[PDB]
Amino acid sequence: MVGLIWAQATSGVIGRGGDIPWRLPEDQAHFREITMGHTIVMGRRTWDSLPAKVRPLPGRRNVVLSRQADFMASGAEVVGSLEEALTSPETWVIGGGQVYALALPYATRCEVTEVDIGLPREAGDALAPVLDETWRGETGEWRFSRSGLRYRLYSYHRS
Ligand SMILES: NC(=O)C1=CN([C@@H]2O[C@H](COP(=O)(O)OP(=O)(O)OC[C@H]3O[C@@H](n4cnc5c(N)ncnc54)[C@H](OP(=O)(O)O)[C@@H]3O)[C@@H](O)[C@H]2O)C=CC1
Ligand SMILES: O=C(O)c1cnn(-c2ccccc2)c1OCCCCc1c[nH]c2ccccc12
Numbered sequence: 824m825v826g827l828i829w830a831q832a833t834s835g836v837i838g839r840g841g842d843i844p845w846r847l848p849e850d851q852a853h854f855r856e857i858t859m860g861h862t863i864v865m866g867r868r869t870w871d872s873l874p875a876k877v878r879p880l881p882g883r884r885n886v887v888l889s890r891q892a893d894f895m896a897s898g899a900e901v902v903g904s905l906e907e908a909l910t911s912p913e914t915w916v917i918g919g920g921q922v923y924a925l926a927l928p929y930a931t932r933c934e935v936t937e938v939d940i941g942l943p944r945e946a947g948d949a950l951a952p953v954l955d956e957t958w959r960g961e962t963g964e965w966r967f968s969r970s971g972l973r974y975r976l977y978s979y980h981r982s
Pocket of ligand 2: 830852855869917
């Protein structure tokens with residue numbers, strides 16, 4: 824099982840400036856719940872976006888994608904290709920825009936949090952992967968985040 828998990832603005836933006844222009848604790852909690860115990864696969868940019876206190880995400884197998892054969896990520900695996908990271912039974916691809924696109928051929932689950940923020944796409948923004956017609960998905964109800972923003976989860980599924 825290879826799944827993808829991300830939050831996005833309505834416009835499709837998922838990152839900007841190497842970080843994320845929002846923070847919803849309710850999605851962090853949901854993120855932790857869905858990934859806990861399993862493999863988490865990230866690109867080197869996303870690993871760098873992670874504070875050193877938080878790194879590696881506890882209780883999970885942290886794997887970094889990087890083309891530098893000597894890149895050190897203390898507490899995680901650094902692999903040169905994505906097939907290396909798919910040896911565990913449940914693997915979740917946690918970003919960013921590059922690795923989401925790499926993993927999409929392997930994926931049958933997309934947990935998408937949609938953040939009600941009007942975030943027009945600027946150059947250099949990272950983006951959610953386009954989901955074609957092979958993906959079926961249940962659209963959740965709008966919820967209120969204590970950060971002021973509304974959000975809703977999409978759960979996309981394919982065979
Ligand atoms: N809203 C959300 O839920 C999420 C948002 N984000 C944000 O989105 C952005 C993510 O960054 P993004 O620009 O997409 O970069 P990535 O996080 O996808 O990392 C790209 C890096 O991964 C390595 N890489 C890319 N392709 C390959 C490949 N085929 N093989 C081996 N290594 C590869 C490279 O490492 P190297 O260059 O060292 O060789 C590359 O620099 C950040 O802003 C982050 O804050 C991150 C995840 C979740
Ligand atoms: O999971 C944990 O236990 C944990 C512990 N600390 N942080 C954390 C908290 C604030 C800032 C950075 C990390 C955790 O998760 C991140 C949840 C934030 C939203 C998020 C959604 N997708 C992501 C992909 C990559 C990084 C962050 C996210």
